[PDB]
Ligand binder design. Sequence first.
Ligand SMILES: [Cu+2]
Ligand SMILES: [Cu+2]
Ligand SMILES: [Zn+2]
Ligand SMILES: [Zn+2]
Lengths: 153, 153
Amino acid sequence: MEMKAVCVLKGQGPVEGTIHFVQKGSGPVVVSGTITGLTEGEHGFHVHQFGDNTQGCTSAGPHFNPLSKKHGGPKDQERHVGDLGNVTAGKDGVAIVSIEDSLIALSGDYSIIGRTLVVHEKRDDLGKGDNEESTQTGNAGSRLACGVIGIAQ
Amino acid sequence: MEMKAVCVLKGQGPVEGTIHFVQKGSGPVVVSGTITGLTEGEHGFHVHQFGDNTQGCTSAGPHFNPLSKKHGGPKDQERHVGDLGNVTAGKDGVAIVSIEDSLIALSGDYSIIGRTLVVHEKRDDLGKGDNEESTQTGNAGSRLACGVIGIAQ
Ligand SMILES: [Cu+2]
Ligand SMILES: [Cu+2]
Ligand SMILES: [Zn+2]
Ligand SMILES: [Zn+2]
């Protein structure tokens, strides 16, 4: 039943974070954590495909997308498995991460264990933007920090 | 059906390396790559239980051990799943890693995805040392470098 994971976000910039995941059986994945050093406002937050850090955050590849879907927010039927939407930083440069997601898992085909969590320079437009980029990355821009999602005690 | 993984080993010291894993179906896992900055001689080399980098290599926990066995060498029946024995650095402090193992996996219960690869200060005595510590860690001593094992393209 009860699975736990951890991710240590690190980057070249001053963005740092610790994210925790817990899933009780078939229950949803509850994500809890903080990110620091952010500019005030919304920042895209996704699970990328590869847990590969040979090229900082570049080697993480694209949004985890085992179904061949277009980019969305967490609530839209049309979304990447990895689409966790946005986290909001305050004027202190800190976001509280508090997400409940049924599509991600810590086991089975949708498991995010050994994939890369990424927080982005800019707001994820949740795939509602006009241009092509919205259907792909939600125009969240740069990868500020990432880590491999690890199994936790 | 082919699965690939990668681990970037990082420490507080001169030891670093990139390790590659490949598993064809339920076959052996082939481990390759290079570690630099090591003292000449044999170094303990294991998969530890947790992919938790919240306290450097310490939060990785003990050897991966889902069958609840004592420590051994990779050829021993009595071994932890994570027991990959020793890598050997030459005069120049380079270890060429070339291992095939039948207990670790890149999927299912023996999966090392989201766990931590550790290279040690000292030789692993392969559980033959005749103190309790041999039966836990092989007297491999401190953790020179580690990384979370991530899904790779
Ligand atoms: Cu992203
Ligand atoms: Cu070890
Ligand atoms: Zn997406
Ligand atoms: Zn062991």
